Symmetry: D2
């Protein structure tokens, strides 16, 4: 029997007071968008309680911010499942129409579910964000879209990516940065250029991004075995490239998690010496995101049901 290692995290575990209402509202939005073809797919999303992830990762934001962020999470889950998760060339050639919409240079066709929804989200983000904040978000979305071609490339040649390549690319394949980009926007504040881009702030963002990607890899491993051999998963990557048992691969992912937490706490102590209020709120945002994501992933029907009944949990 497999033992899932614990994912210790000293960060506060909180949830937005608007979780229940906004989750239902954002799910209804997703259903109305026609981004998902199957009624069964719509129901699987509903059961996953995507709005619980939104509320746990953004526990401080006002209701209208949570709703906007929840709609964005729903777009990403839908897009990730429907577009991304065969042939790198076909998928690369599909991107420019979407990039046109993202740059606001073209009206989507009436039949383009993903384009119509992305246009609406860009407009709604633009209503509550500065041009710098909008571009910050847009840049992260573009990197995410192009990162999906890299996943398609690995599937096309039927290779498990190497640890070095995977850990680098996992930071942008997961879209976590596109959600970090809405922390200040969601809270109604705005980090200045040298606040946002400060090496300490970037380092904490990168470690938070690693933690969320790796934590999802550990907990989503079981359901990913059912889809292209869990190719894009640190458990599969370490098992394959270090010739580990599944149990030892799970433990190595837990080790990398613990080491990233240690690295986060160290850099945070340095940042604490100089950080302004806006930077402190953003870093607390990263902490809520990492901890809220673990709470969500351990409890979501998206991940839990795929684990065999005899799997042990900490």
């Amino acid at each position: 029997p497999l033992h899932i290692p614990p994912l210790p995290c000293p960060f506060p575990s909180e949830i937005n007071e608007h979780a229940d209402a906004v989750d239902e509202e954002s799910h209804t939005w997703l259903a109305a968008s026609h981004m998902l073809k199957g009624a069964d797919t719509v129901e699987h999303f509903r059961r996953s309680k995507i709005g619980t992830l939104a509320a746990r990762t953004n526990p401080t934001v006002p209701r209208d911010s949570l709703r906007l962020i929840n709609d964005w999470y729903n777009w990403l889950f839908a897009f990730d499942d429907a577009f991304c998760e065969h042939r790198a060339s076909a998928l690369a050639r599909a991107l420019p129409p979407l990039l046109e919409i993202l740059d606001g240079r073209r009206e989507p066709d009436g039949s383009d579910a993903f384009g119509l929804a992305l246009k609406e989200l860009l407009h709604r983000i633009s209503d509550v964000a500065s041009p710098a904040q909008v571009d910050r978000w847009r840049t992260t979305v573009k990197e995410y879209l192009f990162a999906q071609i890299w996943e398609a490339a690995n599937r096309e040649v039927d290779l498990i990516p190497t640890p070095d390549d995977y850990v680098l690319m996992r930071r942008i394949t997961g879209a976590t940065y596109t959600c970090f980009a809405l922390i200040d926007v969601g809270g109604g504040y705005r980090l200045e250029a040298e606040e946002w881009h400060h090496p300490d702030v970037r380092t904490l963002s990168d470690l938070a991004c690693d933690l969320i990607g790796w934590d999802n890899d550990l907990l989503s491993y079981a359901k990913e075995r059912g889809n292209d051999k869990a190719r894009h998963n640190l458990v599969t990557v370490l098992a394959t490239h270090k010739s580990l048992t599944l149990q030892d691969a799970l433990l190595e992912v837990a080790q990398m998690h613990n080491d990233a937490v240690a690295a986060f706490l160290d850099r945070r102590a340095a940042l604490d010496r100089w950080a302004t209020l806006p930077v402190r709120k953003y870093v607390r945002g990263l902490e809520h995101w990492v901890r809220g994501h673990i709470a969500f992933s351990l409890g979501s029907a998206r991940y839990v049901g795929a684990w065999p009944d005899d799997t042990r949990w900490p």
Copy 2:
């Protein structure tokens, strides 16, 4: 050069009211930067290094950055030499450039170097040179400026996968897809990102990201990409059917003669210049000194680039002798 049309082509004029200037350090820095490129071992062939020497890449750096001090010009000239060498050897090359999956899978080691997360291998000429340039930019730029440059480089690298995607299935991109992607496949934004750095100043978040500044930057980027497409068309017929070229795209998708394709590129250039002058008038009403300096930077870049493209051995020699110039 062998003629590729039934009757001589007339290269249309590329009118531009922007000042045409050259950095006073052009001659000395061109030679210094070329020596740096040769010393880097990024280019394997002596013949390749010689064709780069003949192209006078430092003339492009000096014309596009005419105001910057010598140390700035040298750094920017080294960056242009990196881009020319990399674009020719990697992006448009036989091994990586003809399959989306191969090019995509080759990027992560380079991205690692770009993020300052890894020492290049002693034999990785492109990686060692990129690490050196990252460090030299970091010496004279704020973290926001370095990240801005790094972001434009990542956008450029990812964009190359799309070019490879087109080569792989042997298709000419449609006009709408090509004009969108041509703004990021050409690395022009990575050079715009060094205008404030080069001049010793720094646009703040809302200056850089202001819709008016982004619009002028996008129009400048269009002009440079299309102007390069017009003048590099002849040399590009010799590699991959000039697939990534507005002339090929319009000729193919609108069923135009090459002469009519060239004229439609010139019309698009004239439209972009008119759009630039219109948006510049709006920006003039609010622009701070740093924003005005950056926009003058865009104007110098567009005009200096036309002068380079009309005069560089990289482009001129591939045109048949019966080609009429503007």
Copy 3:
């Protein structure tokens, strides 16, 4: 008394009466007011109605902080040039965040508490923005005393310039972005268009207060004295200046609308709420 037309929205913070009571209790606890009659006058004045009408969008905690600051200003206004100038360095020391205040000055103790509470919800740049406006307001008081000391009515040009800083309006404009939980960047705040709108709004509030409250430091008196006008003609010229400033505000706002970021738009709506809310409170 001529009308003061104003196309800016008239709104009130829903927390007006709850926070007015809380803030008045805070003022009574501060001992900044000596007389029981003065404390009762302040209670009945509903200073929190001015705070709520001039800051109608801010959350309750922001309204409470701003209401306490208005109470500090009104108390400080209620309580010669040389004496005034020499009284400032101890307030400045508290303001600088350089030393804890003595039990000795009620104004110092409360100013320190407000600085701490502003620092808790503002960036260092925002705190320094507010500090600068408070210093200018304090130094501006000396100028008023200078005129009183030699029994002079100030000239129109001197009065209109100094009236912008004698009234402390800029100290309240400095808490608009803070109160709303956002922050204008240096080049947003200091853009000539944003400074011009800030200055026109400050002009309007000062001139509106002068006219509605109508003595030596009053635009009606200044114009009547220096332009040899009847009281009625002085009142009308003040109303004309008001209408000209409103017109100037709308035209400059139209120019700003071309380029303004969302934070700048929110701030400018803040100026509009302040001008209109001030008139609503005064009437």
Copy 4:
């Protein structure tokens, strides 16, 4: 001008003002100084002129701004000339009432009178700063000038009632009575760069700026003490303030100013080490600007006929 022997009847020892900051001078010092002195002559602000010439104001500009290009040094040199002339040339009530016309010129709401030498010059300098600075940078400078002008009323208030100000009041007010902040406001402008709001206003950067401002004011007070004895009993001078309020001999007051100097240097180095952990390149250039200002000011003041000449012949120099 001065005495052979001490006004105390014992030779006075001027304590050293130790400082590990590099002493540098702008390569354009001599040329720009002459040009700036010409400018001042042409302004008609001086009606004094010969002592300024001998004082070599341009040497202070060049020592305090050693890295800036020639055009920046010239602008800064003209501004120093404006300040030295104004401090010399300029009752609390009369002084307070003289400020608004100057404030109007500063805020562009008024043209100066054809006869207003100081207003005409201030207008020209504002426009020349505006030519090479962002609106935020111009407002930074404008704000420090206003604070400087208002601070002169506090000096007039003490003079009017004949009070020596207390150490706590004087030390606070000395940071704005001296106009030092108006010169710090041109460090980034002079260098062709610009600190962001949260760079400029960071507590570490404000602390270093305030300590640098303290150092320059106290160092000037120590070295200008003899000259200021001949002007309103050296009322506005830390030596007078400490001697009066802490019941010190003048010799012990000089030594206490040097102790405060050494304490401020130590505090600067400690805070600079903390700032080193986060500082961006523009912040590092500005902080190096503060160091050059403090050190260049000591070099200038110790060698200046403006200060050295007033001390008795038996004074013991460091």
